[PDB]
Design a protein around this nucleic acid. Structure first.
Lengths: 133, 36, 123, 175, 138
RNA sequence: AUACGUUAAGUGGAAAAGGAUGUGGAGUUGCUUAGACAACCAGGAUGUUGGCUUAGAAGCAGCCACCAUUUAAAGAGUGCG
């Protein structure tokens, strides 16, 4: 099992994929069409993909959401957070806005509940130093 | 090594007297020591 | 020892309203194997199900002194008790059985628990 | 919480004589042993169960009492199941083969290596890599295992010569 | 490195130490402090050797306390000079020390760090010493 | 010689700072048959390396807000890597 961050819009050249999965016995030609299929809904983003390795050289893949807290910069409206969080509260975000963010992360999050999904994001918003309001 | 004031250096080290002479022993060979 | 009483009195409250339960051996209890079961609890309900591996004969068996007096035989060796709150019984007896058959933790050949006054044979 | 108070069952068939003072002549199909015992210790034979008891709680007695049980358990098992210690040779041209009771060792020294087992001990060579020293005496099998190890002290830089199976020799980076 | 701005006399008698300390036996300015078991002379350089050892290990923290300011000179006749022909000169300074006296104090520091800072000072000081804490009956 | 002990090195019959599961007594305290120290079999966190960074270094360049959930349990980290 070797996780990789294959881009959604492209999958063919050796240097990003190539030998690294080619030594796994993976048939690269047969899967590249698949990476361009389901990920087309979210083109232009770098989508991480888990890769299990069956003994029969069969394969099944699971796509994931773009990485967490990147969205927090957008909701804050600021390009970058403080280098000194809490000591420097550069930005603030409403609790209702956090609800919009947590729902996007649900397939990636292992959180049992939406109320718990809130608390997970709350630990990320504090990393940016952003106040929770 | 041999010094009058043998002391533990890491948690893996253990103090064990042998033949009337205290010796500290560890999984790392460098930490091995004996007093006297 | 006051903390131990919280371990006792709380679990008894579940057993008084408990409906069904199943034996689960603790051997080779991989964390990934647990998550596969925990997700099933999320479908059946929420936090209402309990995994609590407080399976000492000095612990859980004392809870069984009030009700479910069939745990005395199951008490030796590893156990993973489960308790139901609401949820009409069905899949709960079946879901864990499917897991052990595909590797992941010995089932103990299902020693069985309270349902009537019996033991072995999940339905 | 203690060593010698524990009972030792005899699976059988292992008889145990109680001859003074004190000699314990354990007997059976595999062999016999006579461990030395100072008088202060008290050995007794429950039916198919050896027993040991401490005369006092004094610190000197506390040490000796835990040793006497561990030895007797080593004795009975060697009279029954027996014992063996593997030795994993590692290298390229290294190999070993018997020549009579003697065990020739083609160690990398230009001088040929030979080791003669003591009576009651034999060394089969199922493969050139593995080495097995069968014997009823743990003190002797471990001694012979050390004597064979003496022929080649292991090199931390590379797996060579005698090596216990299994054991991790410390890794070293050459340059 | 601590020396008096002025002294009434260039030289003084070496004296004769005896008995329990006249005072300062009980630490209170600091949460913890070194306490000598015996009595012996301490040169000014020995005091500086102790404080430098603590400031590094302590890092950020409360100010180091020093209850003892040296005042008694130790005479040092130049080498190979014959006996007599006048008293020598004060090469340096030495504080008087008595058993049970609080040689140093530390405060505002965590319990783990405090155990070490008192220990490193004990090596620089020839006198045997022991760990001490404030009493509050009180 | 008698009685209660202590000492194991020839200490007794040669010093020190310092070091040590040496041993004999005394005291205090944590846990502990609603379970202790040893184990031997179980698993190791979830988003996540998480913010600020250094090409990248995800338990770990190092500076830290070092969060909250899954819960029988685990620090967004004890350590060999």
């Amino acid at each position: 099992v070797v996780k990789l961050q294959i881009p959604a819009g492209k999958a063919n050249p050796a240097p990003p994929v190539g030998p690294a999965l080619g030594q796994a016995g993976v048939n690269i030609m047969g899967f590249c069409k698949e990476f361009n299929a389901r990920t087309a809904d979210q083109a232009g983003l770098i989508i991480p993909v888990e890769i299990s390795v069956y003994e029969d050289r069969s394969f099944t893949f699971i796509t994931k959401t773009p990485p967490a807290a990147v969205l927090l910069k957008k909701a804050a409206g600021i390009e970058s957070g403080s280098g000194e969080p809490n000591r420097n509260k550069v930005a603030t975000v409403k609790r209702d806005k956090v609800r919009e963010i947590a729902e996007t992360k649900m397939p990636d999050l292992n959180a049992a509940d939406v109320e718990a999904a809130m608390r997970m994001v709350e630990g990320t918003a504090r990393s940016m130093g952003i106040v929770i309001e | 090594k041999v010094r009058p004031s043998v002391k533990p250096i890491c948690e893996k080290c253990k103090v064990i007297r042998r033949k009337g002479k205290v010796m500290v022993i560890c999984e790392n060979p460098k930490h091995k020591q004996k007093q006297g | 020892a006051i903390e131990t009483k919280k371990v006792v009195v709380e679990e008894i409250a579940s057993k008084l309203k408990e409906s069904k339960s199943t034996i689960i051996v603790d051997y080779r209890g991989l964390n990934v194997s647990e998550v596969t079961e925990l997700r099933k609890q999320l479908r059946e309900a929420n936090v209402e199900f309990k995994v609590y591996k407080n399976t000492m004969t000095r612990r859980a068996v004392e809870q069984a002194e009030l009700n479910g007096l069939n745990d005395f035989l199951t008490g030796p060796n590893a156990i993973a008790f489960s308790t139901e709150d609401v949820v009409a019984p069905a899949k709960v007896l079946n879901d864990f059985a499917k897991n052990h058959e595909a590797l992941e933790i010995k089932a103990g050949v299902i020693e069985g628990k309270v349902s009537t006054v019996e033991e072995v044979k999940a339905l | 919480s203690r060593v010698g108070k524990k009972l030792l069952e005899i699976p059988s068939d292992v008889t145990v004589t109680l001859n003074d003072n004190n000699t314990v002549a354990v007997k059976g199909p595999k062999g016999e042993l006579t461990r030395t015992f100072h008088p202060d210790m008290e050995i007794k034979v429950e039916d198919n169960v050896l027993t040991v008891a401490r005369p006092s709680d004094q610190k000197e007695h506390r040490a000796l009492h835990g040793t006497t049980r561990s030895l007797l358990g080593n004795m009975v098992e060697g009279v029954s199941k027996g014992f063996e210690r593997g030795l994993e040779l590692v290298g390229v041209g290294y190999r070993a083969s018997k020549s009579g009771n003697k065990l020739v060792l083609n160690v990398g020294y230009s001088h040929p290596v030979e080791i003669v087992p003591e009576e009651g001990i034999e060394i089969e060579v199922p493969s050139q890599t593995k080495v097995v020293v069968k014997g009823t005496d743990k003190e002797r099998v471990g001694a012979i295992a050390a004597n064979i190890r003496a022929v080649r002290s292991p090199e931390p830089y590379k797996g060579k010569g005698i090596r216990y199976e299994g054991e991790v020799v410390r890794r070293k980076e050459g340059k | 490195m601590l020396l008096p701005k002025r002294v009434k006399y260039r030289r003084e008698h070496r004296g004769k130490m005896r008995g329990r300390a006249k005072g300062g036996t009980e630490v209170h300015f600091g949460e913890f402090g070194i306490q000598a078991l015996e009595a012996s002379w301490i040169t000014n350089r020995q005091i500086e050797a102790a404080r430098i050892a603590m400031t590094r290990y302590m890092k950020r923290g409360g100010k180091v306390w020093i209850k003892i300011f040296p005042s008694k000179p130790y005479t040092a006749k130049p080498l190979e000079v014959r006996m007599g022909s006048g008293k020598g000169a004060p090469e340096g300074w030495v504080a008087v020390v008595k058993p049970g006296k609080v040689l140093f104090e530390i405060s505002g520091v965590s319990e783990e760090v405090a155990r070490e800072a008192l220990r490193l000072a004990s090596h620089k000081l020839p006198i045997k010493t022991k760990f001490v804490k404030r009493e509050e009956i009180g």
